[PDB]
From Swiss-Prot, chain B:
Changing R136K: Does not significantly affect thiol protease catalytic efficiency. Residues 25-36 are annotated as: Loop L1. GO terms for molecular function: aspartic-type endopeptidase activity; cysteine-type endopeptidase activity; cysteine-type peptidase activity; peptidase activity; RNA binding. This is Caspase-7. Heterotetramer that consists of two anti-parallel arranged heterodimers, each one formed by a 20 kDa (p20) and a 11 kDa (p11) subunit. Interacts with XIAP (via its second BIR domain); inhibiting CASP7 activity. Interacts with BIRC6/bruce. Interacts with ATXN3 (short isoform 1). Interacts with HSPA5. The gene is CASP7. Cleavage by different proteases, such as granzyme B (GZMB), caspase-1 (CASP1), caspase-8 (CASP8), caspase-9 (CASP9) or caspase-10 (CASP10) generate the two active subunits. Its involvement in different programmed cell death processes is probably specified by the protease that activates CASP7. Cleaved and activated by initiator caspases (CASP8, CASP9 and/or CASP10), leading to execution phase of apoptosis. Cleavage and maturation by GZMB regulates granzyme-mediated programmed cell death. Cleaved and activated by CASP1 in response to bacterial infection. It comes from Homo sapiens. One of its GO terms (biological process) is proteolysis. Belongs to the peptidase C14A family. Changing Y159 to A/F/W/D/E: Does not significantly affect thiol protease catalytic efficiency. The record marks R136, Y159 as: Involved in allosteric regulation. The modification Phosphoserine is found at S175. Residues 210-224 are annotated as: Loop L4.
Length: 232, 239
């Protein structure tokens, strides 16, 4: 009644796109630690039951195609779909190695009118990537085509997204530990909300620059879901 | 459902909090904006719901842009120490990232900023909720047949529609989102978590509603609301 139906042969497909090294033209640095993120993610989402595949250093055309294909696959025996983007980013756009592409362009392939097999099923996107230059200085019948999506961004619109080259990204470590522990017994919003809490609290940046010292982060969930979602 | 200790927003405060409703029905000729028939109905329903939840609700009417900012900034400067949370609900014309006063347009992000961490210390670690009934663009959903804290934390925006899309409103029955919202809030407002409620409002607006117009450009259209949460705990209005 108030839950998404999970009675399907497979949980669903999980495309993880891991972008580490970029073309010199985009002039964007190597994202160190992103390999830590991907492997940890691969475990969790696999352990949840997703059929996860990891694609490394994709180009924008490559990403668009990856998604479009999956969009055109047959999802009749799937409960849901999940995509995860690890990259450099700006507002509304994510980086391939050869430039940028709008996030909406990657997602819209799964709109109700463009992926019938995934209608009334959750389509989940998790996006760990910078979202702008800002720093949090801290303190003290028919259904709509845009429905059933959920984007969990690593950060709020306009703000930087922090990643340690040694331990991986703040967001990912958090999402992984919570999932490694309650992925099976909590609802998706409960899970993400705790991730919001752990990133907000447990983390604080440290550099030798005063502009980047003791800075903060809060992830941001967008939901057009229409049911509660549990992975079991 | 199971209520697990260090995971709820602490509600044991003298008061639930302020709920400011901004009911904009009438707009200057120069904005080219029309009379939003249905909105008085929407405002009545909402103020009763939020009163019933226990908010101290205040209704403002046909606001200028300056007024909208002023009352919000001043609201942001009151002493919320004895409140568990704050709510603001905007009913107006809107476009991508902006919302109308009677005399023009002002960025939503600029309204909400007043209640940040560094800017409104007495609402720190407390949920600040924002409900927005307004168009966010012109596109139509045609449908388909079956210690330290970040300054931006503890905000939840519940928009009536997705970015870039239209927002529907019966002159007779009021906007879909609002109708749906108030209904769910009546039943389960005191027994369901905020995200559980808004999800149900998502389902209801998506199913129960379909447009009907003599204009085929506007005929048989659909709508999905959009929830954005920077909350760090579950939020229940009771106990």
């Amino acid at each position: 009644t108030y839950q998404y139906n999970m009675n399907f042969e497979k949980l669903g497909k999980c495309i993880i796109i891991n972008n580490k090294n970029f073309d010199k033209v985009t002039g964007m640095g190597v994202r160190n630690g992103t390999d830590k993120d991907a492997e940890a993610l691969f475990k969790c989402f696999r352990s949840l039951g997703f059929d996860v595949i990891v694609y490394n250093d994709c180009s924008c055309a490559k990403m668009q195609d990856l998604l479009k294909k999956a969009s055109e696959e047959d999802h009749t025996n799937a409960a849901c779909f999940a995509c995860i983007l690890l990259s450099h980013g700006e507002e509304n756009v994510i980086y391939g190695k050869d430039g940028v592409t709008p996030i909406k362009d990657l997602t819209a392939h799964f709109r109700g009118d463009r992926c019938k097999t995934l209608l009334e099923k959750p389509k989940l996107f998790f996006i760990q990537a910078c979202r702008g230059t800002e720093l949090d200085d801290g303190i003290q019948y028919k259904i709509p085509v845009e429905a059933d999506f959920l984007f969990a961004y690593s950060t709020v619109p306009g703000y930087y997204s922090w990643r340690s080259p040694g331990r991986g990204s703040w967001f990912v470590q958090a999402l992984c530990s919570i999932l490694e522990e309650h992925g099976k017994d909590l609802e998706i919003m409960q899970i993400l909300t705790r991730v919001n809490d752990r990133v907000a609290r447990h983390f604080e940046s440290q550099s030798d620059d005063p502009h980047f010292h003791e800075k903060k982060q809060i992830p941001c969930v967008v939901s057009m879901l229409t049911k509660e979602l549990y992975f079991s």
